[PDB]
Design a protein around this ligand. Sequence first.
Ligand SMILES: Nc1nc2c(ncn2[C@@H]2O[C@H](COP(=O)(O)O)[C@@H](O)[C@H]2O)c(=O)[nH]1
Length: 147
Amino acid sequence: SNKKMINGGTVNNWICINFSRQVQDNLARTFCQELAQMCYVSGMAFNPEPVLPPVSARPEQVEKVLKTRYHDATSKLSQGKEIDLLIVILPDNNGSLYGDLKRICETELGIVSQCCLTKHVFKMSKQYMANVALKINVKVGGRNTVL
Ligand SMILES: Nc1nc2c(ncn2[C@@H]2O[C@H](COP(=O)(O)O)[C@@H](O)[C@H]2O)c(=O)[nH]1
């Protein structure tokens, strides 16, 4: 048996930010759609569409891009609703970007985030997607089986 979802969590509102120069907008878009689909069919409630389309940013602007995109997306929601998930596409080798990302999301924005390496965005294998869905589920309060 592979791990599966016991209780599927809910992602009604999400956005994507891309930090890889090898990834065009449409590919980030397509990647997130496949991930959203996997999350759903695994047992989550997961909106097939993001609050805002993906945006591409330079790692040097991590603080600015995250805070601005967070503000703009949140202001788009019905009053009192909040963003459930940020999906981040990042370069295979990213130095301090991963850590910066997590510190900002954890301690300033208070948003759940899922990082995805460029290599996986190009391959988009079903096994990868299933694994990332499992991680997302736990992060938003769902529960998975144990082996
Ligand atoms: N743990 C960790 N993962 C990283 C780092 N940089 C990129 N990643 C990628 O981020 C993914 C995990 O993302 P998370 O689930 O923490 O949002 C891993 O698959 C890994 O490929 C890093 O510095 N530390």
